């Protein structure tokens, strides 16, 4: 019978069937209630008249009643499956609290009646999608950025690092600097335009200082963006200042380490004997790692911190916007996974805490 | 019946290649282990690292069990509600590596090593159930 894979993100849910090459459903992680429930696309379309709730904050489920609505919608409306008929693989953020893992397990077995379930760390699934079982993953999404070192499929929690900004923060910063330029973005629709500009026209400069120095004279830097209604926005140095924030969090006022330093700090927390393998298997995942130039810049910066890595290339898979989901589809389709599921019998005997024993 | 029966119980389902019961109170020594394998050779220094106050240095390049180098994956060994640590062995040359769980009872450490390809979750579940039995038995 066919397993399900559901990747629960801060911004986007990706769901589908194990063994498929792509999720069947991708939709916003939002539940909307009136106000005086709608989920996903339909809540988005009616957002003006609803109280919209984002049940997943920085990767962590925080509103269980609304998360149950998201899962019910995923099964019944998007996938059109009876969850009692399908073993279900769910994803979780690195360092997801114990009590949250237990509640997800309880809800799956008691509310949705699944025959079997498993909870996998999102970064571990992206590593598998890249073909590897040992490596370090930089996963940067909408709400959270982590570095997750992994040894033979096991994340190493002591060494997981967090950068306290991700894609939403970058959208906000691009909006700020385009506003300084002279534009105004007051409505929700206008913010979505800025997010699209960010996704289409931004890039990571290899030499940031030189790029700033030469911007005013560049014949190639300025780009224009024309909306369907004929409005035009022009962008210049904001193209590379926006994602520069990943390397220099001071751009949005924070004293935090940038992504090259979190990567280095994470590897240095790991066993001496695995570090070389981590450097050689350093994999980008998540939407916020899609900027052109990110691998070249990471290589440059890591080489400055760890000169032994001069010739080592960063791994930037083309499918990394969906690599978490794809790794889950691969994993749950394999025979090695039959042993890994938590069965209903195991849950009946041990209760929700069984997830602590079985899923790491 | 004695502690060898415990080793038979732990080995019975075919998932593990090695198993041991090691006292860390009253009689500090290997009480039983699978003959000719790795845990039978655990030393008091290695037990000292497992139960010791330093929960950080074993992330420099691991710890050893019977001389076998291992990497720490999760450490909740000294937490009274969890009482477990998960490791995976380290090898050279791309030789296979194996998941290990250690659990802590009132008097013992229970150690289990999976066979090749056996998931760490299965090994943790079995070790935790055995430690839970021993703790219920005042051991």
């Amino acid at each position: 019978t066919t397993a399900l894979v559901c990747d629960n993100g801060s911004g986007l849910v990706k769901a589908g069937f194990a063994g498929d090459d792509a999720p069947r459903a991708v939709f916003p992680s939002i539940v909307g209630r009136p106000r005086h429930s709608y989920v996903g696309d339909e809540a988005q379309s009616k957002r003006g008249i609803l109280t919209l709730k984002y049940p997943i904050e920085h990767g962590i489920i925080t509103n269980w009643d609304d998360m149950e609505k998201i899962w019910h919608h995923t099964f019944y409306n998007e996938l059109r499956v009876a969850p009692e008929e399908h073993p279900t693989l769910l994803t979780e953020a690195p360092l997801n609290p114990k009590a949250n893992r237990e509640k997800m397990t309880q809800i799956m077995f008691e509310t949705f009646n699944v025959p079997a379930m498993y909870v996998a760390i999102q970064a571990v699934l992206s590593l598998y999608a890249s073909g590897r079982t040992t490596g370090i993953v930089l996963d940067s999404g909408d709400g959270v950025t982590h570095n997750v070192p992994i040894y033979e499929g096991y994340a190493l929690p002591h060494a997981i690092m967090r950068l306290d900004l991700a894609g939403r923060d970058l959208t906000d910063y691009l909006m700020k600097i385009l506003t300084e330029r002279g534009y105004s973005f007051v409505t929700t629709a206008e913010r979505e335009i800025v997010r699209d500009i960010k996704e289409k026209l931004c890039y990571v400069a290899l030499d940031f200082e030189n790029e700033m120095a030469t911007a005013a004279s560049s014949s190639s830097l300025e780009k224009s963006y024309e909306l369907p209604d004929g409005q035009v926005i022009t962008i210049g140095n904001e193209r590379f200042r926006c994602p520069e924030t990943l390397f220099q969090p001071s751009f949005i006022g924070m004293e935090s380490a940038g992504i090259h330093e979190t990567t280095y700090n994470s590897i240095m927390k790991c066993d001496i004997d695995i570090r070389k393998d981590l450097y050689a298997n350093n994999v980008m995942s998540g939407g916020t790692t899609m900027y052109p130039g990110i691998a070249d810049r990471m290589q440059k910066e890591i080489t400055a911190l760890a000169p032994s890595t001069m010739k080592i290339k960063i791994i930037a898979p083309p499918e990394r916007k969906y690599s978490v989901w794809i790794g889950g589809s691969i994993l749950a389709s394999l025979s090695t996974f039959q042993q890994m599921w938590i069965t209903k019998q195991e849950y009946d005997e041990a209760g929700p805490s069984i997830v602590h024993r079985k899923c790491f | 019946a004695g502690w060898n029966a415990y080793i038979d119980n732990l080995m019975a389902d075919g998932t593990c290649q090695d198993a041991a019961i090691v006292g860390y109170k009253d009689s500090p020594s290997v009480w039983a282990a699978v003959p000719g394998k790795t845990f039978v050779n655990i030393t008091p220094a290695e037990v000292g690292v497992l139960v010791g106050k330093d929960r950080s240095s074993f992330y420099v390049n691991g710890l050893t069990l019977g001389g076998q180098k291992c990497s720490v994956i999760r450490d909740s060994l000294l937490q009274d509600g969890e009482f477990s640590m998960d490791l995976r062995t380290k090898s050279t040359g791309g030789a296979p590596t194996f998941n290990v769980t250690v659990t802590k009872t009132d008097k013992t450490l229970v150690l289990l090593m999976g066979k090749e390809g056996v998931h760490g979750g299965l090994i943790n579940k079995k070790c935790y159930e055995m430690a839970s039995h021993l703790r219920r038995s005042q051991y």
Partner: peptide, 28 residues
């Protein structure tokens, strides 16, 4: 020497090779 034991309860190719060989299918 160890104390008496209380009674027992009475109630190759590797993972990367399996991953590589997983042939995902188009949707569908």
């Amino acid at each position: 020497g160890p104390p008496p034991a209380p009674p027992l309860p009475a109630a190759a190719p590797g993972l990367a090779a399996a991953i590589a060989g997983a042939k995902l299918r188009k949707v569908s």
